[PDB]
Structure 1
Amino acid sequence: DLEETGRVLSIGDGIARVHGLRNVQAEEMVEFSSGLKGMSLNLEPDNVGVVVFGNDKLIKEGDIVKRTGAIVDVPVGEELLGRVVDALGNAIDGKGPIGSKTRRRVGLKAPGIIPRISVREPMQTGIKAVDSLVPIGRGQRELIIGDRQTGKTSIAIDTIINQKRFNDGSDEKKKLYCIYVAIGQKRSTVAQLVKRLTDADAMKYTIVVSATASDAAPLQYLAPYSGCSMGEYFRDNGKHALIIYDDLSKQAVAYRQMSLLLRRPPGREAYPGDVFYLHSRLLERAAKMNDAFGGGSLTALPVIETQAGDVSAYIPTNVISITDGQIFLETELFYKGIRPAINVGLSVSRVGSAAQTRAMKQVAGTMKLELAQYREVAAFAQFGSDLDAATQQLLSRGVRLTELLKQGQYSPMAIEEQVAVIYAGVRGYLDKLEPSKITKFENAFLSHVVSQHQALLGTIRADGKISEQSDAKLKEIVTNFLAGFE
């Protein structure tokens, strides 16, 4: 055990200027004499700038720093499912060590141009608004952006809970393993989230990487890359993963702290010059591999908190430029009763219909066109009774489809029931009903179709489309329940 070492020249704010270590590599993991870890970020002619994976009160001037000879890596594998880990993969839920066999570097490069195939398979969230108007595909990077307390973590948690129907089935092609990286959150918030995922039985296929608010800035910086490596394990082995960075604003803040303390040249909002490089090299790793590479995929759902809805800030601009679309949430829509508070006018999915089943495509094209016309003429509400019959019909259909998109928390819907509900909506079978009942109807009708009409739902789920027999049967079911509805 003969190791190459150096002396701590100085220590402060979690940065150790270290003498010696002549052969340390850039981004190499070193170990301090107190047992703490560090990463060599600055290789300078006379010193090395080490960022400390912990509390700097244990490091003193003169302490011995050993090399490890390895870039930072994390354990990967299926042994991590159901575990809560830190940024370095150490178990923090007290359930014993992670019995993993494989380790993967956190800073590997993304797949190139050729190993990819187009994003074509749907990633079902269970939220009607997302699955119909902002469809997400496997291999996509869809941003969840919004102000504080607007319902972003709820969208991520619904997407995680929804994959239980696929992970309990036998179709191995449709199974999605979830990963929830929590950066800069309270430990009690993460405990509430873990309890919510356990109650929904969603932990057995979920990893929770936890770099919380009291963890050092390097750990919050590194947690998204650790989670991304844990998901790349599945993406490389023919399986499909989903990863939620909650959120990337806090990782940017941690990286800015590390950079400013390392005396790196600050830029706009004091962020370093390579914060775009940071988020882009994190997000380009979510890919869809072709069959020659196993056909696996990794879907990224980064989260961004905007201040007062300012999407022209630095980090929102960067991550909006990087991703393949955005799900925008509004607090005004939240308090109007529209929940999930998705802004359909601003939300976008540049993958689009290529990430939808044919049935959802059928009903969702119509729903999108109708909601667009409604948004065009929606200012004329408060005067609707004094325009054409066409304008009043646009307003009526628009509010019906709007109430059709509201959804409860922690209750993701299967794609067949979403299609049935949107069918009842965009076919006109809710125009005679008044708005204050739509939601109620949407519930009762649902129960009906779940109880006595498993054949139609199963046939839609198996076909992926609404064939003419399916169309007619849906027609009769809807009209019968509507005629017999209170």
Structure 2
Amino acid sequence: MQLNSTEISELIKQRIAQFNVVSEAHNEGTIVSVSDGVIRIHGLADAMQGEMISLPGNRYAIALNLERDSVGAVVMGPYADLAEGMKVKATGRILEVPVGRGLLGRVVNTLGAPIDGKGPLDHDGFSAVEAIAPGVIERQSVDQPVQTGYKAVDSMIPIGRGQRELIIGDRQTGKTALAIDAIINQRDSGIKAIYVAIGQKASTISNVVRKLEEHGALANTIVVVATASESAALQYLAPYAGAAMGEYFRDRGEDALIIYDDLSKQAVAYRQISLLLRRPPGREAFPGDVFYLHSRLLERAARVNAEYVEAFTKGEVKGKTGSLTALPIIETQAGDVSAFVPTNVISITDGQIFLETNLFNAGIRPAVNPGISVSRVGGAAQTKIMKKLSGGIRTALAQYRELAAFSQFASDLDDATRKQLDHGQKVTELLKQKQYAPMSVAQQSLVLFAAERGYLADVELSKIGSFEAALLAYVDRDHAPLMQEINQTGGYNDEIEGKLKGILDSFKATQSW
């Protein structure tokens, strides 16, 4: 079973053959103070900003304040063992993380050390944590779909390959659920997934990993973890490590989806770091450069043209464009979007999905507010059929909500207004969807066709859900080839509409909800 017990010895012994006797030279400094994870270092004349500073043991610090006669650095780990007068060695290295294909299905901390207990990492080398985003001339327009599996999101608010779509809302409104369902849906789409957990408690991450493992999604996903207990440096650096890990795929011509969970907690950790460094607080006690943090973080998510990929790969990969899609999550306290961090993140991203408590309590789950939510890429990210169906739908629902506000006390409704009110109520009922139940493109297209072409009109509101379920089952058993054609091509034509109309008529005649 473990005959390797002999060979591990040879593996250990060959290290001595690998070791080097050369006497190196390094710059040296001494710790003068230790407090709350921040250390002040005297000396280190050659220290660079952002440099990795090596401490006693295998611990590291990041140099941030290069003041005269003193260096301020933050410890990336448990700082309590440090003491005044300890000797500190300045390396030449910037922060780097393990990166590669082998990270899939592994749980690693912000430093890249595997914490899942599945043994050491297989990886393809190391990449810098801090890196610049591709310039203007290296990008390509976003025109490819990433399917969320949610009717509301995929219809009204399309997300494209290379888009930055903010998920924003109050606590306990389903922000995490939507993102993990988006991760689950990618199990067979070929898009790699990265889930970055900032400041969440470890048991929640255990539950998330268990849910991803209950489906086939975990083998396609990388999980980066920075629990609430870990030092602020690790939490604030966590998104960048995930960004670099996703950028690994983006430059080779593969698609990656990266979920930043609670960037607000990253901003909180950075505020703590800045205040401990005695930097001047700005508005809401946040440091001034907090916008630069999120802006330079989020600008990495982009779609690059084939030329950039060929240049990066030195001709190994030709003709393929890489893309990184980011879905940041922001928590608002009472729907107040005027707060500093929400305003910055809303300014940066290419759109937002608003989840709010009132709709969630009303039973509208997912509680996507069609009015304030918007996608700035729009129809270019959708397949042709989905675009055709949903384009009218989203504004129709918004204006229905307005009309329902207006009409609430009027006894007499014009028949056009009655049509709008009934249609809006039925469409609002239609978009509700249970958790962990993604729908394929063909099924969403079929249901939206059933809604748009008026077939839902006579059905009473409560039976609409059973109508949808029965239609899905009937079409799946009787009309599989058309579903396969729609899922593969996503095309739309006169014969496609005719077949859909025939399917709707046959279902509505023969079947029972």
**TM superposition score normalised by structure 1:** 0.96
Go from structure 1 to structure 2 and tell me whether the alpha carbon gap of 1:465 and 1:385 turns closer, same or farther (over 3 Å shift): farther
Q: Is 2:394 aligned against 1:379? A: no
Q: Is 2:323 aligned against 1:317? A: no
Shift of 1:383: 4.1
SS at match of 1:242: strand
Shift of 1:381: 5.2
Residue 326 of structure 1, aligned match among 334, 340, 352: 352
Q: Is 2:121 aligned against 1:101? A: no
- Structure 1 residues 67-76 or 315-324, which shifts more? 67-76
Match in the other structure for 2:247: 232
Residue 434 of structure 1, aligned match among 460, 466, 469: 460
Given residue 290 of structure 1, which amino acid in structure 2 is its aligned partner? N
Given residue 209 of structure 2, which amino acid in structure 1 is its aligned partner? V
- 8 Å contact from structure 1 (residues 242, 299) kept in 2: yes
- Structure 1 residues 458-467 or 131-140, which shifts more? 458-467
Q: Is 2:391 aligned against 1:356? A: no
Runs of 4+ in 1 over 3 A off after TM superposition: 380-385
Given residue 409 of structure 1, which amino acid in structure 2 is its aligned partner? Q
- RMSD of the TM alignment (CA)? 1.2
Write out aligned runs for 1:9-408 (5 A).
Answer: 9-166=32-189, 175-294=190-309, 295-380=321-406, 382-383=408-409, 386-408=412-434
Distance 1:105 1:62 in 2: 31
- 8 Å contact from structure 1 (residues 240, 297) kept in 2: yes
SS at match of 2:218: coil
- 8 Å contact from structure 1 (residues 384, 391) kept in 2: no
Percent identical pairs in the alignment equals: 59
Distance 2:476 2:164 in 1: 33
Distance 1:310 1:71 in 2: 38
Distance 1:43 1:57 in 2: 23
- Structure 1 residues 131-140 or 450-459, which shifts more? 450-459
- 8 Å contact from structure 1 (residues 384, 395) kept in 2: no
Distance 2:406 2:67 in 1: 65
Match in the other structure for 1:485: 512
Q: What stretches of structure 2 of length at least 5 have no aligned partner?
A: 1-22, 310-320
Shift of 1:149: 0.6
- 8 Å contact from structure 1 (residues 33, 65) kept in 2: yes
Residue 440 of structure 2, aligned match among 414, 429, 443: 414
Distance 1:83 1:91 in 2: 7
Shift of 1:448: 1.4
Distance 2:45 2:218 in 1: 45
Distance 1:334 1:152 in 2: 11
Shift of 1:288: 0.6
Given residue 126 of structure 1, which amino acid in structure 2 is its aligned partner? G
Count of paired positions: 478
Shift of 1:56: 1.9
Q: What stretches of structure 1 of length at least 5 have no aligned partner?
A: 167-174
Go from structure 1 to structure 2 and tell me whether the alpha carbon gap of 1:383 and 1:426 turns closer, same or farther (over 3 Å shift): farther
SS at match of 2:462: helix
- 8 Å contact from structure 1 (residues 150, 341) kept in 2: yes
- 8 Å contact from structure 1 (residues 152, 303) kept in 2: yes
Distance 1:381 1:332 in 2: 20
SS at match of 2:476: helix
SS at match of 1:61: coil
Match in the other structure for 2:475: 449
Shift of 1:375: 2.1
Match in the other structure for 2:499: 473
Given residue 121 of structure 1, which amino acid in structure 2 is its aligned partner? Q
Distance 1:482 1:4 in 2: 80
Distance 1:466 1:446 in 2: 19
Deviations 1:1-25 (A, max 9, x none): 5333211010101100011111111
Distance 2:178 2:475 in 1: 25
- Structure 1 residues 20-29 or 349-358, which shifts more? 20-29
- 8 Å contact from structure 1 (residues 34, 59) kept in 2: no
Given residue 135 of structure 1, which amino acid in structure 2 is its aligned partner? P
Deviations 1:331-364 (A, max 9, x none): 1000111000110101000000011000101111
- 8 Å contact from structure 1 (residues 7, 20) kept in 2: yes
Deviations 1:307-335 (A, max 9, x none): 10011100000000000000010110001
Distance 1:442 1:10 in 2: 66
- 8 Å contact from structure 2 (residues 192, 257) kept in 1: yes
Shift of 1:382: 4.2
Shift of 1:385: 5.5
Shift of 1:27: 0.5
- 8 Å contact from structure 2 (residues 440, 487) kept in 1: no
Match in the other structure for 1:172: none
**TM superposition score normalised by structure 2:** 0.91
Given residue 336 of structure 1, which amino acid in structure 2 is its aligned partner? A
